[PDB]
Scaffold this active site. Structure first.
Site, PDB file in Angstrom:
ATOM      1  N   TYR A  26       0.817  -1.224   0.000  1.00 35.45           N
ATOM      2  CA  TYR A  26       0.000   0.000   0.000  1.00 35.45           C
ATOM      3  C   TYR A  26       0.848   1.270   0.000  1.00 35.45           C
ATOM      4  O   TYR A  26       2.036   1.252   0.337  1.00 35.45           O
ATOM      5  CB  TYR A  26      -1.006   0.022   1.160  1.00 35.45           C
ATOM      6  CG  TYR A  26      -0.410   0.266   2.534  1.00 35.45           C
ATOM      7  CD1 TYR A  26       0.101  -0.793   3.292  1.00 35.45           C
ATOM      8  CD2 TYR A  26      -0.377   1.556   3.093  1.00 35.45           C
ATOM      9  CE1 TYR A  26       0.633  -0.572   4.562  1.00 35.45           C
ATOM     10  CE2 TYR A  26       0.161   1.781   4.360  1.00 35.45           C
ATOM     11  CZ  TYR A  26       0.663   0.714   5.093  1.00 35.45           C
ATOM     12  OH  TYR A  26       1.199   0.898   6.343  1.00 35.45           O
ATOM     13  N   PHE A  36       1.848   9.844   3.425  1.00 34.28           N
ATOM     14  CA  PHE A  36       2.130   9.641   4.870  1.00 34.28           C
ATOM     15  C   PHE A  36       2.670   8.258   5.252  1.00 34.28           C
ATOM     16  O   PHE A  36       3.354   8.134   6.278  1.00 34.28           O
ATOM     17  CB  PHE A  36       0.914   9.986   5.751  1.00 34.28           C
ATOM     18  CG  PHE A  36      -0.338   9.207   5.434  1.00 34.28           C
ATOM     19  CD1 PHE A  36      -0.561   7.957   5.993  1.00 34.28           C
ATOM     20  CD2 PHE A  36      -1.323   9.749   4.598  1.00 34.28           C
ATOM     21  CE1 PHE A  36      -1.731   7.255   5.725  1.00 34.28           C
ATOM     22  CE2 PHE A  36      -2.495   9.041   4.324  1.00 34.28           C
ATOM     23  CZ  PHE A  36      -2.699   7.795   4.897  1.00 34.28           C
ATOM     24  N   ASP A  37       2.347   7.229   4.465  1.00 30.12           N
ATOM     25  CA  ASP A  37       2.857   5.871   4.676  1.00 30.12           C
ATOM     26  C   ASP A  37       2.950   5.109   3.352  1.00 30.12           C
ATOM     27  O   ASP A  37       2.107   5.286   2.471  1.00 30.12           O
ATOM     28  CB  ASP A  37       1.932   5.146   5.658  1.00 30.12           C
ATOM     29  CG  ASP A  37       2.525   3.861   6.234  1.00 30.12           C
ATOM     30  OD1 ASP A  37       3.645   3.449   5.898  1.00 30.12           O
ATOM     31  OD2 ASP A  37       1.850   3.258   7.084  1.00 30.12           O
ATOM     32  N   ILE A  56      -9.022   0.358   9.533  1.00 27.74           N
ATOM     33  CA  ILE A  56     -10.111   1.336   9.286  1.00 27.74           C
ATOM     34  C   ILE A  56     -11.204   0.791   8.359  1.00 27.74           C
ATOM     35  O   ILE A  56     -10.931  -0.059   7.514  1.00 27.74           O
ATOM     36  CB  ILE A  56      -9.598   2.710   8.751  1.00 27.74           C
ATOM     37  CG1 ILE A  56      -8.782   2.578   7.444  1.00 27.74           C
ATOM     38  CG2 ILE A  56      -8.825   3.444   9.843  1.00 27.74           C
ATOM     39  CD1 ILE A  56      -8.495   3.893   6.746  1.00 27.74           C
ATOM     40  N   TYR A  82     -10.348   7.987   9.969  1.00 28.10           N
ATOM     41  CA  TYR A  82     -10.091   8.347  11.393  1.00 28.10           C
ATOM     42  C   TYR A  82     -11.195   9.245  11.972  1.00 28.10           C
ATOM     43  O   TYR A  82     -11.436   9.151  13.192  1.00 28.10           O
ATOM     44  CB  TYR A  82      -8.699   8.968  11.521  1.00 28.10           C
ATOM     45  CG  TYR A  82      -7.569   7.979  11.377  1.00 28.10           C
ATOM     46  CD1 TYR A  82      -7.266   7.089  12.394  1.00 28.10           C
ATOM     47  CD2 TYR A  82      -6.813   7.919  10.219  1.00 28.10           C
ATOM     48  CE1 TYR A  82      -6.235   6.171  12.268  1.00 28.10           C
ATOM     49  CE2 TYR A  82      -5.778   7.009  10.077  1.00 28.10           C
ATOM     50  CZ  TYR A  82      -5.486   6.132  11.106  1.00 28.10           C
ATOM     51  OH  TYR A  82      -4.462   5.226  10.974  1.00 28.10           O
ATOM     52  N   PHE A  99      -5.647   5.531  -0.627  1.00 35.63           N
ATOM     53  CA  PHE A  99      -4.694   4.419  -0.595  1.00 35.63           C
ATOM     54  C   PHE A  99      -4.580   3.772  -1.971  1.00 35.63           C
ATOM     55  O   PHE A  99      -5.588   3.346  -2.534  1.00 35.63           O
ATOM     56  CB  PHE A  99      -5.121   3.367   0.422  1.00 35.63           C
ATOM     57  CG  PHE A  99      -4.965   3.796   1.857  1.00 35.63           C
ATOM     58  CD1 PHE A  99      -5.988   4.499   2.506  1.00 35.63           C
ATOM     59  CD2 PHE A  99      -3.822   3.454   2.589  1.00 35.63           C
ATOM     60  CE1 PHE A  99      -5.865   4.870   3.844  1.00 35.63           C
ATOM     61  CE2 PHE A  99      -3.694   3.827   3.931  1.00 35.63           C
ATOM     62  CZ  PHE A  99      -4.716   4.536   4.556  1.00 35.63           C
TER      63      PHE A  99
HETATM   64  C1  LIG Z   1       4.099   0.758  12.528  1.00 37.23           C
HETATM   65  O1  LIG Z   1       2.925   1.072  11.768  1.00 37.23           O
HETATM   66  C2  LIG Z   1       1.684   0.920  12.484  1.00 37.23           C
HETATM   67  C3  LIG Z   1       0.561   1.356  11.565  1.00 37.23           C
HETATM   68  C4  LIG Z   1       0.541   2.848  11.251  1.00 37.23           C
HETATM   69  C5  LIG Z   1      -0.047   3.674  12.407  1.00 37.23           C
HETATM   70  C6  LIG Z   1      -0.510   5.048  11.896  1.00 37.23           C
HETATM   71  C7  LIG Z   1      -1.416   4.941  10.654  1.00 37.23           C
HETATM   72  C8  LIG Z   1      -1.813   6.352  10.193  1.00 37.23           C
HETATM   73  C9  LIG Z   1      -0.696   4.148   9.544  1.00 37.23           C
HETATM   74  O2  LIG Z   1       0.466   4.867   9.115  1.00 37.23           O
HETATM   75  O3  LIG Z   1      -0.290   2.910  10.095  1.00 37.23           O
HETATM   76  C10 LIG Z   1      -1.562   3.763   8.388  1.00 37.23           C
HETATM   77  O4  LIG Z   1      -1.102   3.782   7.268  1.00 37.23           O
HETATM   78  C11 LIG Z   1      -2.935   3.240   8.501  1.00 37.23           C
HETATM   79  O5  LIG Z   1      -3.782   4.109   8.524  1.00 37.23           O
HETATM   80  N1  LIG Z   1      -3.261   1.915   8.581  1.00 37.23           N
HETATM   81  C12 LIG Z   1      -2.185   0.858   8.551  1.00 37.23           C
HETATM   82  C13 LIG Z   1      -2.517  -0.242   7.543  1.00 37.23           C
HETATM   83  C14 LIG Z   1      -3.897  -0.818   7.815  1.00 37.23           C
HETATM   84  C15 LIG Z   1      -4.933   0.286   7.710  1.00 37.23           C
HETATM   85  C16 LIG Z   1      -4.682   1.445   8.685  1.00 37.23           C
HETATM   86  C17 LIG Z   1      -5.134   1.000  10.047  1.00 37.23           C
HETATM   87  O6  LIG Z   1      -6.321   0.862  10.224  1.00 37.23           O
HETATM   88  O7  LIG Z   1      -4.236   0.765  11.010  1.00 37.23           O
HETATM   89  C18 LIG Z   1      -4.611   0.461  12.381  1.00 37.23           C
HETATM   90  C19 LIG Z   1      -5.084   1.762  13.086  1.00 37.23           C
HETATM   91  C20 LIG Z   1      -3.953   2.797  13.213  1.00 37.23           C
HETATM   92  C21 LIG Z   1      -5.616   1.561  14.511  1.00 37.23           C
HETATM   93  C22 LIG Z   1      -6.789   0.595  14.705  1.00 37.23           C
HETATM   94  C23 LIG Z   1      -8.011   0.901  13.820  1.00 37.23           C
HETATM   95  C24 LIG Z   1      -9.174  -0.053  14.153  1.00 37.23           C
HETATM   96  C25 LIG Z   1      -9.526  -0.029  15.653  1.00 37.23           C
HETATM   97  O8  LIG Z   1     -10.498  -1.038  15.932  1.00 37.23           O
HETATM   98  C26 LIG Z   1      -8.282  -0.317  16.501  1.00 37.23           C
HETATM   99  O9  LIG Z   1      -8.621  -0.224  17.889  1.00 37.23           O
HETATM  100  C27 LIG Z   1      -7.886  -1.090  18.764  1.00 37.23           C
HETATM  101  C28 LIG Z   1      -7.190   0.707  16.183  1.00 37.23           C
HETATM  102  C29 LIG Z   1      -3.350  -0.182  12.972  1.00 37.23           C
HETATM  103  C30 LIG Z   1      -3.060  -1.595  12.466  1.00 37.23           C
HETATM  104  O10 LIG Z   1      -2.102  -1.456  11.400  1.00 37.23           O
HETATM  105  C31 LIG Z   1      -2.545  -2.554  13.572  1.00 37.23           C
HETATM  106  C32 LIG Z   1      -1.980  -3.864  12.992  1.00 37.23           C
HETATM  107  C33 LIG Z   1      -3.651  -2.884  14.565  1.00 37.23           C
HETATM  108  C34 LIG Z   1      -3.815  -2.426  15.809  1.00 37.23           C
HETATM  109  C35 LIG Z   1      -2.873  -1.465  16.513  1.00 37.23           C
HETATM  110  C36 LIG Z   1      -4.994  -2.853  16.685  1.00 37.23           C
HETATM  111  O11 LIG Z   1      -6.086  -3.389  15.957  1.00 37.23           O
HETATM  112  C37 LIG Z   1      -4.593  -3.813  17.802  1.00 37.23           C
HETATM  113  O12 LIG Z   1      -5.743  -3.869  18.670  1.00 37.23           O
HETATM  114  C38 LIG Z   1      -5.503  -4.102  20.061  1.00 37.23           C
HETATM  115  C39 LIG Z   1      -4.176  -5.209  17.384  1.00 37.23           C
HETATM  116  O13 LIG Z   1      -4.982  -6.103  17.433  1.00 37.23           O
HETATM  117  C40 LIG Z   1      -2.729  -5.486  16.969  1.00 37.23           C
HETATM  118  C41 LIG Z   1      -2.568  -6.695  16.005  1.00 37.23           C
HETATM  119  C42 LIG Z   1      -1.883  -5.677  18.241  1.00 37.23           C
HETATM  120  C43 LIG Z   1      -0.362  -5.432  18.119  1.00 37.23           C
HETATM  121  C44 LIG Z   1       0.284  -5.692  19.498  1.00 37.23           C
HETATM  122  C45 LIG Z   1       0.002  -4.026  17.657  1.00 37.23           C
HETATM  123  C46 LIG Z   1       0.247  -3.750  16.384  1.00 37.23           C
HETATM  124  C47 LIG Z   1       0.556  -2.383  15.945  1.00 37.23           C
HETATM  125  C48 LIG Z   1       0.944  -2.178  14.674  1.00 37.23           C
HETATM  126  C49 LIG Z   1       1.190  -0.819  14.187  1.00 37.23           C
HETATM  127  C50 LIG Z   1       1.460  -0.521  12.895  1.00 37.23           C
HETATM  128  C51 LIG Z   1       1.577  -1.616  11.849  1.00 37.23           C
END
Ligand SMILES: CO[C@H]1C[C@@H]2CC[C@@H](C)[C@@](O)(O2)C(=O)C(=O)N2CCCC[C@H]2C(=O)O[C@H]([C@H](C)C[C@@H]2CC[C@@H](O)[C@H](OC)C2)C[C@@H](O)[C@H](C)/C=C(\C)[C@@H](O)[C@@H](OC)C(=O)[C@H](C)C[C@H](C)/C=C/C=C/C=C/1C
Length: 107
Positions: A26, A36-37, A56, A82, A99
């Site tokens: 993506y 941004f990403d 999302i 968001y 995206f």
């Molecule tokens: C290092 O990078 C960041 C991502 C950055 C963060 C900043 C963003 C602007 C953006 O740059 O990605 C972006 O491009 C984006 O918008 N993305 C990413 C690609 C998918 C679509 C979209 C996008 O939805 O991402 C999401 C929302 C941020 C949060 C979620 C939106 C739905 C809502 O229900 C969630 O409530 C809990 C919050 C982040 C996801 O990726 C990750 C994998 C998921 C989560 C943090 C949560 O689910 C979490 O729960 C408890 C989990 O279970 C995970 C599996 C647990 C684990 C311990 C933590 C993982 C963290 C990974 C962080 C990553 C990969």
């Protein structure tokens, strides 16, 4: 909502069922076009499970209707991304996101 516009076609047959992890490449950008990403820039695809509210709403509904090999432009409304809060320091309030996403394979 979300608008899917196909850039490059997939097979038109292999759609992601719930349970499967989607592996995709993506590039996320704001409405003006500023990135941004991007997973492509890192050279590392993004894996996530569909229909678990992991991502999302625009992704949850948009990627669900894509086939394997397809590349598409996902224009996502702020209430399908968001919203009013945004994602502080990356995505501001009331932001329409775009995206460029490619569904590489399912695992
Ligand atoms: C290092 O990078 C960041 C991502 C950055 C963060 C900043 C963003 C602007 C953006 O740059 O990605 C972006 O491009 C984006 O918008 N993305 C990413 C690609 C998918 C679509 C979209 C996008 O939805 O991402 C999401 C929302 C941020 C949060 C979620 C939106 C739905 C809502 O229900 C969630 O409530 C809990 C919050 C982040 C996801 O990726 C990750 C994998 C998921 C989560 C943090 C949560 O689910 C979490 O729960 C408890 C989990 O279970 C995970 C599996 C647990 C684990 C311990 C933590 C993982 C963290 C990974 C962080 C990553 C990969």
């Amino acid at each position: 909502g979300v608008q899917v516009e196909t850039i490059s076609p997939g097979d038109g047959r292999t759609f992601p069922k719930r349970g499967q992890t989607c592996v995709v490449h993506y590039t996320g950008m704001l409405e003006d076009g500023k990135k941004f990403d991007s997973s492509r820039d890192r050279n590392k695809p993004f894996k996530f499970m569909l229909g678990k509210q992991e991502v999302i709403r625009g992704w949850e509904e948009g990627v669900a209707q894509m086939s394997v090999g397809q590349r598409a432009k996902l224009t996502i409304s702020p209430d399908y991304a968001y919203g009013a809060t945004g994602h502080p320091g990356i995505i501001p309030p009331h932001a329409t996101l775009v995206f460029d996403v490619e569904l590489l394979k399912l695992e």
